[PDB]
Every structure is written in C-alpha cells, then in structure tokens.
Amino acid sequence: PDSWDKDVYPEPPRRTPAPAPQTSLPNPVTYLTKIFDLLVDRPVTLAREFIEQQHAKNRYYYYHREFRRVPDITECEEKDILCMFEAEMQWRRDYKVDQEIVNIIQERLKACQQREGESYRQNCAKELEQFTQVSKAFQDRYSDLGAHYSARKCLAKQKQRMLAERKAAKEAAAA
Amino acid sequence: MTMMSGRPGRVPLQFLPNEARSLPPPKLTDPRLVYMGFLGYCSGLIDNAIRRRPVVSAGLHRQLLYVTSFVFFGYYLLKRQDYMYALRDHDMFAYVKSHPEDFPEKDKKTYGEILEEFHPVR
Numbered sequence: 683p684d685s686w687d688k689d690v691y692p693e694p695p696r697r698t699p700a701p702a703p704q705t706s707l708p709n710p711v712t713y714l715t716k717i718f719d720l721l722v723d724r725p726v727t728l729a730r731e732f733i734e735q736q737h738a739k740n741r742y743y744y745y746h747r748e749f750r751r752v753p754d755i756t757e758c759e760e761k762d763i764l765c766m767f768e769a770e771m772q773w774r775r776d777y778k779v780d781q782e783i784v785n786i787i788q789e790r791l792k793a794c795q796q797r798e799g800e801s802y803r804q805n806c807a808k809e810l811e812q813f814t815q816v817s818k819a820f821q822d823r824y825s826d827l828g829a830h831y832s833a834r835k836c837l838a839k840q841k842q843r844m845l846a847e848r849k850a851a852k853e854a855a856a857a
Numbered sequence: 858m859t860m861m862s863g864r865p866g867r868v869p870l871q872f873l874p875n876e877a878r879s880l881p882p883p884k885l886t887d888p889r890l891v892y893m894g895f896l897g898y899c900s901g902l903i904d905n906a907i908r909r910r911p912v913v914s915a916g917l918h919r920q921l922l923y924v925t926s927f928v929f930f931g932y933y934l935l936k937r938q939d940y941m942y943a944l945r946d947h948d949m950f951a952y953v954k955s956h957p958e959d960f961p962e963k964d965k966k967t968y969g970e971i972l973e974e975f976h977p978v979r
C-alpha cells in the first residue's frame with residue numbers, strides 16, 4: 683500500500699500465472715478459499731470500514747521534526763564546550779541515521795533472498811553489492827571506536843586513515 | 858603556610874571588614890541557613906531525649922531558642938565565608954592582570970588542525 687515509499691523499498695512487477703485446470707475433479711483449494719473469503723474476509727472488512735469511518739470524523743496530524751545543521755567538530759576550538767556539545771549531538775544523530783540506512787539495506791537484502799526462492803544466488807546480486815558497499819562505508823566510519831565513542835575519536839580515526847592513504851599514494855607515485 | 862594571615866590592611870580581630878558591606882547579604886531563605894536551623898532543631902531534640910523528656914513536645918521555648926541561635930550564628934558565618942571567597946577571587950584576578958607574562962593567551966587551534974592519536978578498541 684501507500685504507507686511506505688516504493689522507491690526506498692522496491693519490488694519486482696509481481697508476475698503470477700493464470701490457473702490452467704487439467705482435471706475433471708474440483709479443486710478443494712478454490713472451494714476452501716471461497717469459504718474463507720466469505721466467512722472471514724468480509725466481516726473483517728466491515729469492521730475495518732466502521733473503524734475507518736469513525737477515524738475520518740477525527741483527523742489530526744503529527745509532523746516530522748526538522749533539525750538545522752550546526753558546525754561540525756572540525757570547526758570547534760580545543761576547549762570550546764558549547765560548540766563541542768552541539769557538534770557531538772549532531773554527530774550522534776547522524777550515527778543513528780546511518781544505522782537506519784544500514785537497516786533499510788539489510789531489509790532489502792532479506793526480502794530479496796526470500797522472494798527469489800531457489801534462484802536467490804543469482805537474482806539478488808545487486809542487493810548483495812549494495813549491502814557490501816554500505817557495510818564497508820559504515821565499518822570505516824564507526825567500527826573500533828568502542829564504548830565511550832565520540833565525534834573526536836571518529837575524527838582521529840578519519841585523520842589516521844587519510845594519513846595512511848596519503849602515504850600509500852605518495853609511495854605508489856614514486857614507483 | 859598561611860595564605861591570608863598577613864594581607865595588607867587586615868584588622869586583627871574584626872570578623873567583618875567594612876569592605877564586606879559591598880557584597881549582597883545571604884537571603885534569609887538561604888538553604889545553608891535552613892540547614893543550620895535544622896541543626897538547631899536536632900540539638901533541641903537530642904536535648905529532650907538525653908534528659909528523658911518527651912522528645913517532640915517537651916520544651917517548645919527551648920527548641921525555639923536552639924533554632925534561633927543556630928540561625929543567628931549561621932547568618933554571620935555565611936557572610937564571613939562569602940567575604941573570604943570574594944577576597945580570594947579579587948586577589949587572583951588582580952595578580953593575573955598585573956603579571957601578563959605568566960598567563961599568556963596562546964593561539965586557538967580548531968580540532969580540524971590538531972592531530973589526535975586514535976586508539977582502536979578491539
């Protein structure tokens with residue numbers, strides 16, 4: 683349904699075959715499905731219609747909270763406590779958002795594996811590639827910080843990685 | 858070592874220099890004063906209990922005098938304590954202002970230019 687965006691959680695076009703009866707015998711599954719429909723799906727639908735009718739008479743909205751962007755930990759003086767506090771809060775929010783991004787990608791991967799059935803090893807290559815990329819990025823950013831993590835430790839990790847990459851690049855240039 | 862024993866202009870047994878009158882007095886609802894009154898009330902209760910009298914009801918005049926005396930002493934005690942701390946801060950700031958070489962304000966460095974070692978936890 684329209685509850686979620688179908689671009690963030692995509693699905694294939696859902697091709698299903700038409701029934702081709704080849705026996706004179708009746709199909710018990712169809713008879714049981716008709717019984718289940720008429721006996722379960724209709725009263726539930728009526729109850730849902732009543733509940734939605736009651737809901738439409740009382741409609742109110744809640745809004746997603748917006749946050750502005752503040753200076754990062756790089757634009758803060760060494761002992762400036764207030765700027766450090768704002769930067770740390772913003773960094774923590776970004777960490778939560780990145781965790782949720784990884785969660786979305788993992789949900790895509792699991793849904794693909796279940797959906798594709800016996801052809802999952804070939805039909806889910808793109809989702810596996812996306813998860814590998816996002817996992818590599820996330821791992822670089824936050825792994826090994828440990829408990830008592832902060833924006834300063836993440837910055838130190840990034841600086842160390844940049845220094846190593848610069849040295850490797852300059853030594854490969856001399857080759 | 859005595860830090861304030863011989864500070865120029867100090868009167869030997871004053872307990873409250875005239876300079877202290879320039880500071881805001883403690884409010885009568887100061888929680889420290891309330892704690893001193895609590896101490897006086899506890900002293901009154903212990904006085905009742907030691908003398909084998911009904912602890913809460915025995916002497917109301919005595920308990921009132923206890924609370925009043927503790928509050929009365931505590932008010933002047935707090936005034937003197939606040940005066941001493943104001944003196945300490947005044948002297949500190951004057952000395953820092955008069956010796957600029959010993960208290961330099963060096964250049965501020967942002968965290969984007971300071972190299973901090975990263976220690977992985979694994």
Ligand SMILES: CCCCCCCCCCCCCCCCCC(=O)OC[C@H](COP(=O)([O-])OCC(O)COP(=O)([O-])OC[C@@H](COC(=O)CCCCCCCCCCCCCCCCC)OC(=O)CCCCCCCCCCCCCCCCC)OC(=O)CCCCCCCCCCCCCCCCC
Pocket residue numbers: 899902903906910911912913
């Ligand atoms: C941290 C936050 C704040 C906490 C503050 C600190 C703690 C509280 C304050 C401490 C001092 C205050 C009390 C001092 C006098 C107490 C002496 C005493 O004997 O009491 C008996 C006395 C009973 O005597 P009685 O009623 O005349 O008749 C019974 C006979 O006397 C029958 O008596 P008896 O002599 O025949 O019975 C014998 C008994 C008699 O022996 C005792 O009663 C022991 C009392 C020793 C007093 C404590 C020592 C000095 C204070 C130091 C406390 C240190 C606290 C820090 C933590 C360390 C813990 C020790 O001895 C034993 O049975 C041996 C038992 C061995 C146990 C050993 C443990 C003893 C030490 C425990 C101290 C804990 C703190 C005080 C406990 C409360 C005591 C009432 O108790 C009371 O009735 C008075 C207590 C209530 C008064 C306060 C109520 C205020 C009014 C109500 C309205 C509130 C206003 C709210 C405002 C908002 C508007 C609504």
Ligand SMILES: CCCCCCCCCCCCCCCCC[C@@H](O)O[C@H](CO[C@H](O)CCCCCCCCCCCCCCC)COP(=O)(O)OCC[N+](C)(C)C
Pocket residue numbers: 862868869870871872
């Ligand atoms: C266990 C609790 C301790 C309680 C101790 C006794 C408390 C009751 C005693 C009442 C004190 C009365 C003295 C005040 C009357 C006027 C005298 C005044 O002029 O004396 C001044 C001095 O003031 C007194 O010293 C202040 C006494 C207050 C003591 C209380 C502080 C206790 C520490 C915190 C514990 C909480 C106490 C709570 C009390 C209920 C003179 O200053 P100065 O001549 O230049 O100093 C000589 C010493 N020097 C030079 C070497 C420094």
